[PDB]
Structure 1
Amino acid sequence: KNRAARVRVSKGDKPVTYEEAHAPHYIAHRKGWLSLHTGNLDGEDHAAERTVEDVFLRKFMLGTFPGCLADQLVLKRRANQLEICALVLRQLPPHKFYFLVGYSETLLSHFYKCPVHLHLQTVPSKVVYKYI
């Protein structure tokens, strides 16, 4: 029985995000990729760096934006700039949201020594794909 990245069947009441409801064998069939970069294509270099980098930005966004994160965080790399999209729940009063926008962009840009672009799409409640 494969336990990989899966969400078990409950008494049937458990709310589930579209992503967490689609099991590993489904990648590239229904589900998409959470990140995008050149590094894994045939002739390409430095895949590892974009992986460490990605991981750290998962943890970073989960920690800078407490309790307000909706679904897993969507990274794109385009021509040396990062485009970080987030689905974010509405909890915070908007001031704090922009505080953290500036905070994040600046901090990251100076950490990875490349320009970062941030996008928050705000959602009233976690989207429910199944059950509920």
Structure 2
Amino acid sequence: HAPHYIAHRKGWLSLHTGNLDGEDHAAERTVEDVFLRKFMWGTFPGCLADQLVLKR
């Protein structure tokens, strides 16, 4: 599925309150997600079947 299905057919891999109206620290959560994904893809090489789901 293509990017224009993110709220129609797909969902969001990461789920956090940062991007809600009135909340803060969206950038810090984004950088955290970036590091988690690279770290996990480097620590489980060839094991991950799909993308991670990061819940908070």
TM-score bracket, normalised by the shorter chain, equals over 0.9
Segments of structure 1 that go 5 or more residues without pairing to the other structure are 1-21, 77-132
Larger fraction in strand: 1
Total equivalences in the alignment: 55
Q: What is the alpha-carbon root mean square deviation over aligned residues?
A: 0.4
Identity %: 98
Report the CA distance between 1:58 and its aligned residue: 0.4
The two structures have a TM-score, normalised by structure 2, of 0.95
Residue 25 of structure 1 and its aligned partner are, at CA, apart by 0.4
- Runs (4+) of structure 1 moved beyond 4 Å? none
Structure having greater relative contact order (Cα 8 Å, sep ≥ 6): 2
* Structure that is richer in helix per residue: 2
Question: Runs of 5+ in structure 2 lacking a partner?
Answer: none
The whole-number CA distance in structure 2 between the counterparts of 1:46 and 1:33 is 18
Deviations 1:47-84 (A, max 9, x none): 000000000000000000111111011100xxxxxxxx
State how 1:1-132 maps to structure 2 within 5 Å.
Answer: 22-76=1-55
Shift of 1:30: 0.5
